[PDB]
Amino acid sequence: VSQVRQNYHSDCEAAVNRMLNLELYASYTYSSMYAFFDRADVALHNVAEFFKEHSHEEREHAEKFMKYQNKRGGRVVLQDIKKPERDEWGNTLEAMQAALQLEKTVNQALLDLHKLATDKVDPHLCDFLESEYLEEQVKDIKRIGDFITNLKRLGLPENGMGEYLFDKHSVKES
Amino acid sequence: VSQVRQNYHSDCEAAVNRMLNLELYASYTYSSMYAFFDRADVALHNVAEFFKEHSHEEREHAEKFMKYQNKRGGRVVLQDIKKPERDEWGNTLEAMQAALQLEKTVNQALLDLHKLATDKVDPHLCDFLESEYLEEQVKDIKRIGDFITNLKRLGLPENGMGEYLFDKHSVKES
Amino acid sequence: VSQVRQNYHSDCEAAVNRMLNLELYASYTYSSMYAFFDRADVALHNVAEFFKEHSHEEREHAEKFMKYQNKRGGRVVLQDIKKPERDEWGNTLEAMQAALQLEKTVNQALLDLHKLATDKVDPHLCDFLESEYLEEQVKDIKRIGDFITNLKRLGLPENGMGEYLFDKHSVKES
Amino acid sequence: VSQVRQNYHSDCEAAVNRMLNLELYASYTYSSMYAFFDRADVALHNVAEFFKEHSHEEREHAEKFMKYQNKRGGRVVLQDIKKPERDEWGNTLEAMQAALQLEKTVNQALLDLHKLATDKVDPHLCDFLESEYLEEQVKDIKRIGDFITNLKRLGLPENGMGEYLFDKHSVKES
Ligand SMILES: [Cl-]
Ligand SMILES: [Cl-]
Ligand SMILES: [Cl-]
Ligand SMILES: [Cl-]
Ligand SMILES: [Cl-]
Ligand SMILES: [Cl-]
Ligand SMILES: [Cl-]
Ligand SMILES: [Cl-]
Ligand SMILES: [Cl-]
Ligand SMILES: [Cl-]
Ligand SMILES: [Cl-]
Ligand SMILES: [Cl-]
Ligand SMILES: [Cl-]
Ligand SMILES: [Cl-]
Ligand SMILES: [Cl-]
Ligand SMILES: [Cl-]
Ligand SMILES: [Cl-]
Ligand SMILES: [Cl-]
Ligand SMILES: [Cl-]
Ligand SMILES: [Cl-]
Ligand SMILES: [Cl-]
Ligand SMILES: [Cl-]
Ligand SMILES: [Cl-]
Ligand SMILES: [Cl-]
Ligand SMILES: [Cl-]
Ligand SMILES: [Cl-]
Ligand SMILES: [Cl-]
Ligand SMILES: [Cl-]
Ligand SMILES: [Cl-]
Ligand SMILES: [Cl-]
Ligand SMILES: [Mg+2]
Ligand SMILES: [Mg+2]
Ligand SMILES: [Mg+2]
Ligand SMILES: [Mg+2]
Ligand SMILES: [Mg+2]
Ligand SMILES: [Mg+2]
Ligand SMILES: [Mg+2]
Ligand SMILES: [Mg+2]
Ligand SMILES: [Mg+2]
Ligand SMILES: [Mg+2]
Ligand SMILES: [Mg+2]
Ligand SMILES: [Mg+2]
Ligand SMILES: [Mg+2]
Ligand SMILES: [Mg+2]
Ligand SMILES: [Mg+2]
Ligand SMILES: [Mg+2]
Ligand SMILES: [Mg+2]
Ligand SMILES: [Mg+2]
Ligand SMILES: [Mg+2]
Ligand SMILES: [Mg+2]
Ligand SMILES: [Mg+2]
Ligand SMILES: [Mg+2]
Ligand SMILES: [Mg+2]
Ligand SMILES: [Mg+2]
């Protein structure tokens, strides 16, 4: 084993690699959403930029898992980054609904990794998840839930004027 | 077709999507190299950071293709991002040799896209490649060639002291 | 011939004069749109100012063709600047639809001039078009396409409130 | 018992006193390493200063345990601080190998205290260890592992020039 490795279970090492892949997958989905809302036949640029920023955030969270893996003496093992489930994202409501489900999927994987770290008595990995991931996850889920409620209030999907207004007022001007 | 689309061939649209995928593939390879040199049993951190920066550069070049696709009225279509060819990168010389070959692969795909844009009489796409890609490519290839020459001069792969010195002197201090 | 003239075909010289006239024609159309939206019975002043700015841009692009003609040793030959096709422009959607078609007309003439410069092996004229015209054209077409999509979303032409909101939010406050 | 004491097990109190002693022991070992590398017949002053700084860090971590003990209502009980295992430290590689083993010894004691705090359902003590100790420990272990890899690369112990270069380049200039 590595000279630095201490109290780091093989199972946790492997689950960290799977988490790295899932963050890369999430980043790629958000990039797809960015590309969709940037289209001339969609043209909701503040929404597009929101998703672009979330793609960059998820990529940074993947990089943090890489750094973590190495700090603990495990080995970063990469797999293919699967393309997103959809090629087009319908409208702001459909996209935000998909984003919510993606954030919950990532959150469940984080919570599952915390259970594993707990089972293997790894308090460093527990701390890492609690301090760097779990609360920012709860915030992102809350924000997207807030958005979905407002998009429904604005009459999505039918109400184009409501969709226009969300883009001007609910997401930061880009 | 899109209302914005003008003088944009289907073939070019598709080749732009393939180029986007290749830039994402290149970014992912550089990330792998970063992760390798960051290891406690490799520990060449300036080299690692060089590759990290090149991964971020390639990702930005992918994003530029997405934006381009939309500007011309084509449709961004994503595919899986294949994992890198190797899981470990040997040493600085082997990595830089792989980097050189990757940059030449990307350059050939850019040159092939320029031939296609020329065949389809698309001067906007030609300009884009010439102004945003081809010269920065030539610079990156030259830099990596310079590095390889210096790594050989320093006695790689056998000469560890030479590898240590390259990391301190040839790549920017991180 | 002029002492400065080198590698400049008569055909290209003449096509540059026609391009100068077309830019002046485009500027004049945008001025008409400005005047329409400035009316007390139309009164969409941010839209008006958008068109005014685009009129000034096209006039500057005409001036650039004049300067070019002289730099290459050709002779600027002016013709009448035809009045715009319409005297009134209906509403923001109709105007933007007309603007899109005008920008595409100008783009096709630029692309036709690039084909001619290519046929006559004039790389300076090719560069000029690529560096000063073709990309800014693609950007203007994309912007107007984005606008049209949003105007449709806002319920134009029937939805006056949507037209009001476009003027406040989609074009820069004047 | 103390008026402030709540949910603080006797066992944890005692283990905190043992941890305080171990941090003082670690500080004293690093001081010995400092003194060795400061010698005129060793004379690697940047290495010496690295160990001096780590001695001061460990002493501060001991002081933090004292403060903790009092905050929780336990009683600081001091024991002798045993002299280091060696009186001379061979060379930079031997010293760093000893440092790695010391950091792992301290880390295991921290992890053992976390297990005890977990057994006695003391989340405050768990937090304290996670927030103030465990991650900085992982960082120090990683740094020393990185160093050992570079010292081997530089040809230690035989290669004096490599040892000289490590002192100039790998540790901060003092
Ligand atoms: Cl290992
Ligand atoms: Cl282990
Ligand atoms: Cl294990
Ligand atoms: Cl990526
Ligand atoms: Cl789809
Ligand atoms: Cl967090
Ligand atoms: Cl909200
Ligand atoms: Cl509604
Ligand atoms: Cl199309
Ligand atoms: Cl077309
Ligand atoms: Cl086609
Ligand atoms: Cl491999
Ligand atoms: Cl370039
Ligand atoms: Cl060089
Ligand atoms: Cl050699
Ligand atoms: Cl002449
Ligand atoms: Cl001539
Ligand atoms: Cl001629
Ligand atoms: Cl005029
Ligand atoms: Cl009319
Ligand atoms: Cl341009
Ligand atoms: Cl827009
Ligand atoms: Cl409506
Ligand atoms: Cl007490
Ligand atoms: Cl108690
Ligand atoms: Cl007790
Ligand atoms: Cl001794
Ligand atoms: Cl810590
Ligand atoms: Cl290092
Ligand atoms: Cl040696
Ligand atoms: Mg394993
Ligand atoms: Mg598939
Ligand atoms: Mg927190
Ligand atoms: Mg977040
Ligand atoms: Mg997150
Ligand atoms: Mg409003
Ligand atoms: Mg097609
Ligand atoms: Mg495969
Ligand atoms: Mg050319
Ligand atoms: Mg250039
Ligand atoms: Mg470059
Ligand atoms: Mg490149
Ligand atoms: Mg003539
Ligand atoms: Mg007439
Ligand atoms: Mg040609
Ligand atoms: Mg340009
Ligand atoms: Mg323009
Ligand atoms: Mg133009
Ligand atoms: Mg007691
Ligand atoms: Mg004794
Ligand atoms: Mg915590
Ligand atoms: Mg912390
Ligand atoms: Mg520390
Ligand atoms: Mg410590």
From Swiss-Prot, chains A, B, C, D:
Keywords: Iron, Iron storage, Metal-binding, Oxidoreductase. It comes from the Eukaryota. It is an enzyme of class 1 (oxidoreductase). Fe cation 1 binds at residues 23, 58, 61. CDD domains: Ferritin. Residues 6-155 form the Ferritin-like diiron domain. It catalyses: 4 Fe(2+) + O2 + 4 H(+) = 4 Fe(3+) + 2 H2O. The keyword Metal-binding applies. One of its GO terms (cellular component) is cytoplasm. GO terms for biological process: intracellular iron ion homeostasis; iron ion transport. Fe cation 2 binds at residues 58, 103, 137, 140. Oligomer of 24 subunits. The functional molecule is roughly spherical and contains a central cavity into which the polymeric mineral iron core is deposited. PANTHER family: FERRITIN. There are three types of ferritin subunits in amphibia: L, M and H chains. M and H chains are fast mineralizing; the L chain is very slow mineralizing. Stores iron in a soluble, non-toxic, readily available form. Important for iron homeostasis. Has ferroxidase activity. Iron is taken up in the ferrous form and deposited as ferric hydroxides after oxidation. Belongs to the ferritin family. This is Ferritin, middle subunit. It comes from Aquarana catesbeiana (American bullfrog).
